[PDB]
Design a protein around this ligand. Structure first.
Ligand SMILES: Nc1ncnc2c1ncn2[C@@H]1O[C@H](COP(=O)(O)OP(=O)(O)O)[C@@H](O)[C@H]1O
Length: 286
Protein backbone atom coordinates (compact mmCIF):
# COMPACT_ATOMS: atom_id res chain seq x y z
CA UNK A 1 0.00 0.00 0.00
CA UNK A 2 2.04 2.95 -1.28
CA UNK A 3 1.47 6.61 -0.52
CA UNK A 4 -0.99 8.04 -3.05
CA UNK A 5 -0.77 11.44 -4.72
CA UNK A 6 -4.40 12.56 -4.64
CA UNK A 7 -5.79 15.12 -7.07
CA UNK A 8 -7.00 18.38 -5.57
CA UNK A 9 -10.37 18.12 -7.35
CA UNK A 10 -10.95 14.74 -5.68
CA UNK A 11 -10.48 16.22 -2.21
CA UNK A 12 -12.52 19.26 -3.29
CA UNK A 13 -15.62 17.25 -4.16
CA UNK A 14 -15.13 14.59 -1.46
CA UNK A 15 -15.37 17.30 1.22
CA UNK A 16 -18.32 18.92 -0.63
CA UNK A 17 -16.18 21.86 -1.70
CA UNK A 18 -14.56 21.87 1.76
CA UNK A 19 -18.01 22.29 3.28
CA UNK A 20 -18.48 22.80 7.01
CA UNK A 21 -20.79 19.78 7.25
CA UNK A 22 -17.79 17.44 6.94
CA UNK A 23 -15.41 19.68 8.92
CA UNK A 24 -14.52 17.87 12.16
CA UNK A 25 -11.73 20.18 13.34
CA UNK A 26 -9.89 23.37 12.44
CA UNK A 27 -7.50 25.88 13.95
CA UNK A 28 -4.34 25.27 15.92
CA UNK A 29 -2.93 22.78 13.41
CA UNK A 30 -5.23 22.55 10.40
CA UNK A 31 -8.71 21.98 9.07
CA UNK A 32 -9.72 18.31 9.28
CA UNK A 33 -12.62 16.87 7.28
CA UNK A 34 -14.33 13.49 7.37
CA UNK A 35 -14.76 12.33 3.79
CA UNK A 36 -15.46 9.35 1.56
CA UNK A 37 -13.16 9.14 -1.45
CA UNK A 38 -14.55 8.21 -4.85
CA UNK A 39 -13.28 4.64 -4.35
CA UNK A 40 -15.28 4.40 -1.10
CA UNK A 41 -12.37 4.97 1.29
CA UNK A 42 -13.40 6.55 4.59
CA UNK A 43 -10.65 9.08 5.29
CA UNK A 44 -9.72 12.15 7.30
CA UNK A 45 -8.42 15.06 5.23
CA UNK A 46 -6.18 17.64 6.91
CA UNK A 47 -6.22 20.98 5.09
CA UNK A 48 -2.98 22.51 6.32
CA UNK A 49 -2.98 25.95 7.96
CA UNK A 50 -0.46 28.63 6.91
CA UNK A 51 1.18 26.86 3.98
CA UNK A 52 3.52 29.81 3.32
CA UNK A 53 6.62 28.33 4.97
CA UNK A 54 5.24 27.29 8.35
CA UNK A 55 2.76 24.69 7.09
CA UNK A 56 5.09 23.41 4.36
CA UNK A 57 7.60 22.47 7.06
CA UNK A 58 4.87 20.60 8.95
CA UNK A 59 3.78 19.09 5.62
CA UNK A 60 7.21 17.61 4.94
CA UNK A 61 7.64 16.78 8.64
CA UNK A 62 4.74 14.34 8.24
CA UNK A 63 5.86 13.30 4.75
CA UNK A 64 9.34 12.52 6.11
CA UNK A 65 8.12 10.57 9.15
CA UNK A 66 4.60 9.11 9.21
CA UNK A 67 4.48 9.06 5.39
CA UNK A 68 7.52 6.76 5.16
CA UNK A 69 6.61 4.22 7.87
CA UNK A 70 3.68 1.95 8.71
CA UNK A 71 2.89 0.51 12.14
CA UNK A 72 -0.23 -0.88 13.77
CA UNK A 73 -0.05 1.83 16.49
CA UNK A 74 0.67 4.80 14.19
CA UNK A 75 -2.02 6.65 12.26
CA UNK A 76 -1.82 5.61 8.57
CA UNK A 77 -1.02 8.44 6.17
CA UNK A 78 -2.74 7.31 2.98
CA UNK A 79 -2.20 10.28 0.66
CA UNK A 80 -1.15 13.86 0.07
CA UNK A 81 -1.88 16.81 -2.21
CA UNK A 82 0.54 19.60 -3.17
CA UNK A 83 -1.05 22.47 -5.13
CA UNK A 84 0.44 25.96 -4.88
CA UNK A 85 -0.50 27.44 -1.50
CA UNK A 86 -2.63 24.39 -0.59
CA UNK A 87 -1.21 21.47 1.41
CA UNK A 88 -3.45 18.49 2.18
CA UNK A 89 -2.79 15.21 3.99
CA UNK A 90 -5.13 12.20 3.96
CA UNK A 91 -5.35 9.60 6.72
CA UNK A 92 -7.39 6.49 7.36
CA UNK A 93 -10.40 7.54 9.40
CA UNK A 94 -10.28 6.63 13.10
CA UNK A 95 -13.80 5.80 14.24
CA UNK A 96 -13.82 6.97 17.87
CA UNK A 97 -11.51 9.96 17.46
CA UNK A 98 -8.93 11.18 19.96
CA UNK A 99 -8.31 9.79 23.43
CA UNK A 100 -8.76 13.29 24.88
CA UNK A 101 -12.33 13.59 23.58
CA UNK A 102 -13.23 10.25 25.17
CA UNK A 103 -11.73 10.99 28.60
CA UNK A 104 -13.44 14.41 28.66
CA UNK A 105 -16.60 13.30 26.89
CA UNK A 106 -18.77 15.84 25.04
CA UNK A 107 -21.63 16.50 27.48
CA UNK A 108 -20.60 13.26 29.25
CA UNK A 109 -21.80 10.94 26.49
CA UNK A 110 -20.29 8.51 24.01
CA UNK A 111 -17.96 5.57 24.66
CA UNK A 112 -16.69 4.61 28.11
CA UNK A 113 -13.19 3.20 28.65
CA UNK A 114 -12.82 0.53 31.32
CA UNK A 115 -9.37 -0.30 32.66
CA UNK A 116 -8.96 -3.30 30.34
CA UNK A 117 -9.40 -0.87 27.43
CA UNK A 118 -7.25 1.95 28.83
CA UNK A 119 -4.41 -0.50 29.52
CA UNK A 120 -4.54 -1.71 25.91
CA UNK A 121 -4.46 1.94 24.82
CA UNK A 122 -1.44 2.58 27.06
CA UNK A 123 0.39 -0.49 25.74
CA UNK A 124 -0.42 0.40 22.14
CA UNK A 125 0.62 4.03 22.54
CA UNK A 126 3.90 2.84 24.08
CA UNK A 127 4.59 0.40 21.23
CA UNK A 128 4.13 3.12 18.62
CA UNK A 129 6.58 5.47 20.34
CA UNK A 130 9.09 2.66 20.90
CA UNK A 131 8.95 1.91 17.18
CA UNK A 132 9.76 5.57 16.50
CA UNK A 133 12.57 5.54 19.08
CA UNK A 134 14.09 2.09 18.49
CA UNK A 135 13.05 0.59 15.15
CA UNK A 136 13.40 3.78 13.08
CA UNK A 137 16.83 4.81 11.83
CA UNK A 138 16.96 7.79 11.86
CA UNK A 139 15.00 7.92 15.12
CA UNK A 140 11.77 9.93 15.23
CA UNK A 141 10.94 12.36 18.04
CA UNK A 142 7.21 13.12 18.08
CA UNK A 143 7.78 16.33 20.12
CA UNK A 144 4.02 16.71 20.76
CA UNK A 145 2.75 13.53 22.41
CA UNK A 146 -0.55 14.08 24.22
CA UNK A 147 -3.98 12.52 24.63
CA UNK A 148 -5.38 14.44 21.64
CA UNK A 149 -2.64 12.89 19.46
CA UNK A 150 -3.73 9.36 20.39
CA UNK A 151 -6.41 8.23 17.94
CA UNK A 152 -8.78 5.34 18.66
CA UNK A 153 -9.68 3.07 15.74
CA UNK A 154 -12.77 0.88 15.39
CA UNK A 155 -11.33 -1.53 17.98
CA UNK A 156 -10.34 1.24 20.45
CA UNK A 157 -6.69 0.50 19.70
CA UNK A 158 -4.30 3.42 20.09
CA UNK A 159 -2.75 5.00 17.01
CA UNK A 160 -0.35 7.90 17.59
CA UNK A 161 -1.01 10.86 15.29
CA UNK A 162 0.01 14.45 14.45
CA UNK A 163 3.59 14.15 13.24
CA UNK A 164 3.46 17.80 12.09
CA UNK A 165 6.24 18.67 14.56
CA UNK A 166 8.15 15.37 14.42
CA UNK A 167 11.88 15.51 13.71
CA UNK A 168 14.41 12.94 12.53
CA UNK A 169 17.33 12.31 14.90
CA UNK A 170 20.34 10.17 14.07
CA UNK A 171 20.88 7.02 16.12
CA UNK A 172 24.44 8.29 16.73
CA UNK A 173 23.01 11.25 18.70
CA UNK A 174 21.46 11.61 22.15
CA UNK A 175 19.54 14.80 21.36
CA UNK A 176 18.37 17.06 18.54
CA UNK A 177 18.73 20.85 18.63
CA UNK A 178 15.65 22.73 17.44
CA UNK A 179 14.57 26.36 17.06
CA UNK A 180 11.15 26.44 18.70
CA UNK A 181 9.71 25.04 21.94
CA UNK A 182 7.12 22.76 20.38
CA UNK A 183 4.69 20.81 22.51
CA UNK A 184 1.54 21.52 24.48
CA UNK A 185 1.42 23.01 27.99
CA UNK A 186 0.95 20.18 30.45
CA UNK A 187 3.16 17.78 28.47
CA UNK A 188 6.41 19.74 28.06
CA UNK A 189 9.40 18.07 29.76
CA UNK A 190 10.90 20.43 32.36
CA UNK A 191 14.33 20.39 30.69
CA UNK A 192 12.87 21.53 27.34
CA UNK A 193 12.51 25.02 28.83
CA UNK A 194 16.27 25.02 29.48
CA UNK A 195 17.54 24.47 25.92
CA UNK A 196 16.23 24.33 22.35
CA UNK A 197 16.83 20.58 22.34
CA UNK A 198 14.45 17.63 22.13
CA UNK A 199 15.05 13.92 22.68
CA UNK A 200 13.33 10.56 22.88
CA UNK A 201 13.45 10.94 26.66
CA UNK A 202 11.28 14.02 26.14
CA UNK A 203 8.64 11.94 24.36
CA UNK A 204 8.83 9.49 27.27
CA UNK A 205 7.99 12.30 29.69
CA UNK A 206 5.01 13.32 27.55
CA UNK A 207 3.89 9.69 27.36
CA UNK A 208 3.94 9.54 31.16
CA UNK A 209 1.41 12.38 31.26
CA UNK A 210 -0.82 10.39 28.88
CA UNK A 211 -0.47 7.31 31.09
CA UNK A 212 -1.50 9.53 34.00
CA UNK A 213 -4.62 10.57 32.08
CA UNK A 214 -5.55 6.91 31.56
CA UNK A 215 -5.04 6.40 35.32
CA UNK A 216 -6.41 9.66 36.77
CA UNK A 217 -8.85 10.74 34.06
CA UNK A 218 -8.00 14.43 34.55
CA UNK A 219 -6.61 17.13 32.27
CA UNK A 220 -2.88 17.89 32.51
CA UNK A 221 -3.67 21.63 32.39
CA UNK A 222 -0.70 20.90 37.23
CA UNK A 223 -1.55 17.20 36.98
CA UNK A 224 2.03 15.91 37.10
CA UNK A 225 2.90 17.69 40.34
CA UNK A 226 -0.49 16.91 41.89
CA UNK A 227 0.04 13.15 41.53
CA UNK A 228 3.59 13.46 42.88
CA UNK A 229 2.52 15.56 45.88
CA UNK A 230 -0.29 13.10 46.64
CA UNK A 231 2.08 10.17 46.04
CA UNK A 232 3.56 10.92 49.48
CA UNK A 233 0.07 10.89 51.03
CA UNK A 234 -2.83 8.64 49.98
CA UNK A 235 -2.11 7.17 46.54
CA UNK A 236 -5.50 5.41 46.62
CA UNK A 237 -7.21 8.77 45.95
CA UNK A 238 -5.28 9.83 42.82
CA UNK A 239 -6.74 7.23 40.43
CA UNK A 240 -9.89 7.60 38.37
CA UNK A 241 -13.02 7.00 40.51
CA UNK A 242 -14.60 5.05 37.64
CA UNK A 243 -11.63 2.66 37.60
CA UNK A 244 -12.05 2.19 41.36
CA UNK A 245 -15.82 1.78 40.99
CA UNK A 246 -15.26 -1.18 38.64
CA UNK A 247 -13.24 -3.32 41.07
CA UNK A 248 -11.02 -2.32 44.03
CA UNK A 249 -8.93 -5.41 43.24
CA UNK A 250 -6.92 -3.92 40.37
CA UNK A 251 -5.48 -1.27 42.73
CA UNK A 252 -2.11 -3.22 39.31
CA UNK A 253 -2.78 0.51 38.98
CA UNK A 254 0.17 1.43 41.22
CA UNK A 255 2.39 -0.88 39.16
CA UNK A 256 1.42 1.15 36.10
CA UNK A 257 1.60 4.32 38.21
CA UNK A 258 5.24 3.48 38.94
CA UNK A 259 5.78 3.40 35.18
CA UNK A 260 4.11 6.81 34.80
CA UNK A 261 6.20 8.17 37.68
CA UNK A 262 9.42 6.80 36.18
CA UNK A 263 8.51 8.43 32.85
CA UNK A 264 7.75 11.74 34.59
CA UNK A 265 11.18 11.96 36.24
CA UNK A 266 12.69 15.44 36.13
CA UNK A 267 16.03 13.90 35.11
CA UNK A 268 15.96 12.71 31.49
CA UNK A 269 18.67 10.14 32.27
CA UNK A 270 16.51 8.41 34.91
CA UNK A 271 13.52 8.00 32.60
CA UNK A 272 13.20 4.55 31.01
CA UNK A 273 13.27 4.06 27.28
CA UNK A 274 9.99 3.14 25.62
CA UNK A 275 11.54 -0.29 25.04
CA UNK A 276 11.84 -0.53 28.82
CA UNK A 277 8.29 0.81 29.27
CA UNK A 278 7.01 -2.05 27.11
CA UNK A 279 8.98 -4.63 29.11
CA UNK A 280 7.60 -3.12 32.33
CA UNK A 281 4.08 -3.60 30.95
CA UNK A 282 5.01 -7.19 30.10
CA UNK A 283 6.13 -7.89 33.68
CA UNK A 284 2.82 -6.63 35.08
CA UNK A 285 1.01 -9.11 32.82
CA UNK A 286 2.96 -11.96 34.45
N1 LIG B 1 -7.02 10.16 11.08
C1 LIG B 1 -8.09 10.61 11.78
N2 LIG B 1 -9.19 9.85 11.95
C2 LIG B 1 -10.26 10.28 12.64
N3 LIG B 1 -10.33 11.49 13.22
C3 LIG B 1 -9.29 12.35 13.14
C4 LIG B 1 -8.09 11.95 12.39
N4 LIG B 1 -7.23 12.98 12.46
C5 LIG B 1 -7.83 13.96 13.19
N5 LIG B 1 -9.06 13.58 13.59
C6 LIG B 1 -10.00 14.39 14.40
O1 LIG B 1 -10.05 15.72 13.88
C7 LIG B 1 -9.90 16.68 14.93
C8 LIG B 1 -8.81 17.66 14.55
O2 LIG B 1 -7.58 17.00 14.80
P1 LIG B 1 -6.19 17.80 14.90
O3 LIG B 1 -6.49 19.28 14.82
O4 LIG B 1 -5.21 17.18 13.93
O5 LIG B 1 -5.76 17.45 16.41
P2 LIG B 1 -4.23 17.49 16.89
O6 LIG B 1 -3.75 18.86 16.46
O7 LIG B 1 -4.31 17.32 18.38
O8 LIG B 1 -3.62 16.32 16.15
C9 LIG B 1 -9.52 15.93 16.19
O9 LIG B 1 -10.48 16.18 17.22
C10 LIG B 1 -9.50 14.46 15.83
O10 LIG B 1 -10.36 13.72 16.71
Amino acid sequence: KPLRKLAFADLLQATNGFHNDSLIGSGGFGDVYKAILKDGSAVAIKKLIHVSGQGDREFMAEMETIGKIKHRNLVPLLGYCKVGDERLLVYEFMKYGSLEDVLHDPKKAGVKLNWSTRRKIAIGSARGLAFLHHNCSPHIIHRDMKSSNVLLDENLEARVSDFGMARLMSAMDTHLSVSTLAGTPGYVPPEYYQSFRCSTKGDVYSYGVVLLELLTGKRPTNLVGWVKQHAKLRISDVFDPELMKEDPALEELLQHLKVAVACLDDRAWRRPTMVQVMAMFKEIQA
